[PDB]
Structure formats: structure tokens, C-alpha cells
Specification:
binds heme C, 0% strand, binds sodium ion, 4 helices, globular, electron transport
């Protein structure tokens, strides 16, 4: 259901951080992403429903 991260990034992140292929958040970390949602960085708190498995999948595709 989770895909490989590409759909999750496109649906939840690309509007603010760019298409995955040219994302400004390449090389991010799970700790940065969880902290950004939890701290509402840039208004990101609405993403608090994403699970650890979903956030990690997004981190991993940004590492490729
Ligand atoms: C617009 C409503 C955004 C959504 C959707 C996403 N991000 Fe975001 N994020 C946004 C801003 C304005 C900021 C602060 C400025 C900055 O770009 O740093 C952030 C912050 C982050 C961070 C923390 C900063 C860092 O360590 O680089 C991360 C890790 C981050 N954003 C990642 C990220 C992810 C993975 C998103 C989809 C789940 C996502 N953001 C969505 C604006 C918006
Ligand atoms: Na806000």
C-alpha cells in the first residue's frame, strides 16, 4: 500500500519542496522529518497523521 516512497513524496511534499527529481530535501533524515512535522515547521503539522513507515519511505526515496 505504501509504494516505494515516490507516491508518498508527490502527494505530501512536492508542492512545497519541489518534484522528487529536483527536491530541495534530498539527503534529509527521519529525525529531521519527524521533528519538522511535530514542530509544525513551515506549517507541516498537518502531516502528523503519517506513520513512521510512511515518513521513512519518503526519507529513503530522498536519499536515492
Ligand atoms: C508546505 C505546506 C510544505 C509541505 C507540504 C512540506 N514542507 Fe517541509 N517545510 C516547509 C517549510 C516552509 C519548511 C521550513 C523551511 C525549510 O525548507 O527548511 C519546511 C521544513 C522541512 C524540514 C526541516 C528542515 C530540514 O531539516 O531540512 C524537513 C526535513 C522537511 N520540511 C521535509 C518535508 C517532507 C519530507 C515533506 C513531505 C512529507 C514536507 N517537508 C512537506 C514547507 C512544506
Ligand atoms: Na502553521
Amino acid at each position: 500500500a505504501d509504494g516505494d516512497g515516490q507516491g508518498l513524496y508527490a502527494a505530501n511534499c512536492a508542492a512545497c519542496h519541489g518534484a522528487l527529481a529536483t527536491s530541495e530535501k534530498k539527503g534529509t533524515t527521519l529525525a529531521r522529518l519527524q521533528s519538522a512535522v511535530s514542530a509544525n515547521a513551515g506549517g507541516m503539522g498537518f502531516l502528523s497523521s503519517l506513520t513512521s513507515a510512511q515518513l521513512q519511505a519518503i526519507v529513503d526515496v530522498l536519499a536515492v
